[PDB]
Design a protein around this ligand. Sequence first.
Ligand code: HEM
Ligand code: HEM
Ligand code: A1CN9
Ligand code: A1CN9
Ligand code: H4B
Ligand code: H4B
Ligand code: ZN
Lengths: 414, 414
Amino acid sequence: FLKVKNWETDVVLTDTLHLKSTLETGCTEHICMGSIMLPSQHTRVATKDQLFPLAKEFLDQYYSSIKRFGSKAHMDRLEEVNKEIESTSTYQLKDTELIYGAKHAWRNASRCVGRIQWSKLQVFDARDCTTAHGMFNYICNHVKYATNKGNLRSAITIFPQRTDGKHDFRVWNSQLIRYAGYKQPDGSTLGDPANVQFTEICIQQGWKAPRGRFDVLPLLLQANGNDPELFQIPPELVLEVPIRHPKFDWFKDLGLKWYGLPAVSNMLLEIGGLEFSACPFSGWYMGTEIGVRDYCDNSRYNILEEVAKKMDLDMRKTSSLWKDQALVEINIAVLYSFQSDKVTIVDHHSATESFIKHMENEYRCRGGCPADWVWIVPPMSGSITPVFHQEMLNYRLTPSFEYQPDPWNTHVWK
Amino acid sequence: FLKVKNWETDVVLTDTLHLKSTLETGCTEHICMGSIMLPSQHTRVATKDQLFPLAKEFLDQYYSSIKRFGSKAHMDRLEEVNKEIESTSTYQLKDTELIYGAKHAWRNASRCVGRIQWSKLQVFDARDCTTAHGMFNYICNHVKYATNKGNLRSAITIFPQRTDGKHDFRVWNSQLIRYAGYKQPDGSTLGDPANVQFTEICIQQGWKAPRGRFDVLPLLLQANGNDPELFQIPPELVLEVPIRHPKFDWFKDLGLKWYGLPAVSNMLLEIGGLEFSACPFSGWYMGTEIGVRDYCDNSRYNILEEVAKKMDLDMRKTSSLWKDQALVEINIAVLYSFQSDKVTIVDHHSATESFIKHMENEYRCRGGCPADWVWIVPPMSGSITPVFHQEMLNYRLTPSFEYQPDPWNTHVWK
Ligand code: HEM
Ligand code: HEM
Ligand SMILES: Cc1cc(N)nc(COc2cc(CCN3CCC(F)(F)CC3)cc(F)c2F)c1
Ligand SMILES: Cc1cc(N)nc(COc2cc(CCN3CCC(F)(F)CC3)cc(F)c2F)c1
Ligand SMILES: C[C@H](O)[C@H](O)[C@H]1CNc2nc(N)[nH]c(=O)c2N1
Ligand SMILES: C[C@H](O)[C@H](O)[C@H]1CNc2nc(N)[nH]c(=O)c2N1
Ligand SMILES: [Zn+2]
């Protein structure tokens, strides 16, 4: 029955939810790994013996959720899934169980600061898909729906679950919409340095690169274990925000833009012991993901250089904080630009207030809320936001989103 | 033999030092508490049975450190301390062992970002002190020495070790130099809201408050378990920096200042199982401790209000980032002000680069370096500093600094 404190409001919450926790963290009584990026407990073959405990555990919380725990409908479904796991050594979720499962994987994502919206998620069942073309079609409808004219809406599309392991559905893009990255002759990088290897893989399978800055990458969709195929998202579906500043008329000359829809595509959805290796999900951007990390990480676009130049800043000395000063302007501009185009965006102050509010509700009507402080605190202005001052307990609950190896290091090619 | 990665330079280090680790963290295989502020494993009665293992373990690393491990001088000292722990059920450190012990408590402080200087620490042996007046004198000499005309120098003063427990030396101030805090009639707070209870305790024992903003508090020194006594540091020894900005000539009108010397006084030094309940230590300020936390925490001085006002900022909307913009100017000003007075200060960029450099040396010539990411990353501009991108392993090594309860909740009064 552990306690967590906010050292800004002296507010205390009591966590009993962590008792239901199952998976492991990486920490021991003698070491803490709370700052390892992809621990071996966050990354993803299962057998029939292990499946029914996982399925029972999931069914028991789903039926306890619709206020019919242990009734006839529960007991028969428990038996029904038992039977099918004898027969096929696996099983299929009901539509209702897939929606519940998917929504609580988000709910349980301890590194997600936006979880106040977890119950307002739109679940697209693509488990009848058999071809890369079918996936491309499902994904396009996802983009259209979730974008909704800049009035962004949360959604997820779920392709068929892993079976044997060699008949796996995978999106090879880490995100549905990303900008290309090309190395140069002098070694420097055009576009996005993160994607330079993926941009090469696309050109290896036959992409024709418009070798520039903000070139939207094509999709690489692998269906039922087959070699993945390239498809270009119709440009009218890729909504983009040109970045301007409310003071500096040279900010337009900087010539930056960004896509509206953050849609993570490379991770694994786990529901009652079933593994969904392709489950792209989308919401809306918190400003700092673009303005701080995307734009200003050294190994990303790295624009602190030029923004400070045009501001005419004391750049000889490290302690003039010219880096800090150009970082705040970049985030004022990303925010402003999205908002003047009616495209949904949230500032790190509003989003962190909501998560504290959300934490309140979770400890009250659920007995806790797993939270990863290292990831919740925004990458700028940490301590002028309320999450910096909030103790958080991190633990792993299922249903969950998990990391998985990149397919090009696993795919038995041809 | 665990591995930690920097996800900015792709640099990898290997940690074997954590195998020598002894104390516990608070985390388990099923929960991570890396964001609990004062876990029960960081806070501090010991007996004679437990003492010799602790003493042997300390002696073995001290003698392995001067390149005479297990020699005659080691074996006799091992025996010599054994004998004295039979006799007195405790023991005394040699001057050399006290210096080594003290320096490695800093070295092992995983929440300290400044540890690159750990070997350049000046150890003042005050274990012959018997009176609160003696403590006051030792502390004044500490302040003078460590301040060194603004050319600050690291130092620590070590009063006699705990014995029975009721004859304990304690400094009641959380820091040697702090500003007073007074509540108002309307409930608001003048000075520093952190110290309002301590400021009351001083007035309870008889302080005469010059009820203003930056009033340096008196010392409250408890000697050998006796009721603590008040002493005022000679003002000529308390060096202070008036805060101005290199652009805004209304920054002087803001009327802020800060003391030069950060000197933490309320914690416990543990060396070979001996407990030093009074061990004030000092270095120099990283800028963000004043400009971000001291000045801009909601429950501290909370000046983001007025700094943004005088900048004439868009303060109606949360997403104008006026808070962020006024925070960078405040830290440019604290830095600038200290530097124009030849008072030692370090910016969060320089200090975090040094710690990565320091981490390099520690993994190479020591096999690791315990580090608390939650505390190392600075409270502003997190990800434009290299520590944000560095995985760190946190574990507890001894000698160490530990938290301890405040004395006014423990002291059997009179
Ligand atoms: C609705 C608006 C949303 C916002 C503002 C938001 C915000 C964020 C942010 C800032 C991160 C940190 C990631 C990074 O810095 O790279 C994150 C991580 C994450 N979010 Fe959310 N997100 C939203 C929607 C969603 C949805 C719809 C899902 C799933 C259905 C989701 C699940 C996750 C997961 C799994 C992570 C990563 C955890 C990990 O790395 O293990 N989020 N989110
Ligand atoms: C030399 C310049 C130094 C700098 C720049 C520095 C910087 C810092 C900073 C920024 C923190 C975070 C504390 C906070 O945010 O409130 C910290 C914590 C700490 N430092 Fe250092 N420090 C220095 C010297 C020292 C010395 C001389 C000692 C001991 C001999 C020391 C031991 C510690 C300890 C024990 C902590 C707190 C760990 C905890 O909370 O458990 N530091 N330091
Ligand atoms: C739906 C959604 C909304 C939003 N507003 N934002 C996001 C971004 O969510 C994720 C972001 C990442 C990034 C992984 N990480 C990037 C930085 C690095 F490359 F350095 C290391 C790997 C992984 C995930 F699983 C995520 F859900 C997602
Ligand atoms: C020598 C030195 C140099 C420097 N440059 N800086 C410091 C500040 O070091 C410490 C600071 C603290 C603060 C404790 N913490 C304050 C914020 C809070 F009140 F919210 C919770 C408690 C505890 C310690 F043990 C420290 F060594 C020390
Ligand atoms: C080393 C560290 O774990 C790594 O840089 C993490 C820190 N916290 C983060 N937090 C978020 N939201 N996103 C990130 O990529 C990271 N990176
Ligand atoms: C809740 C959280 O543990 C707490 O606010 C911590 C976060 N990290 C910190 N880091 C430093 N350097 N100083 C602090 O006071 C804190 N506070
Ligand atoms: Zn941990």
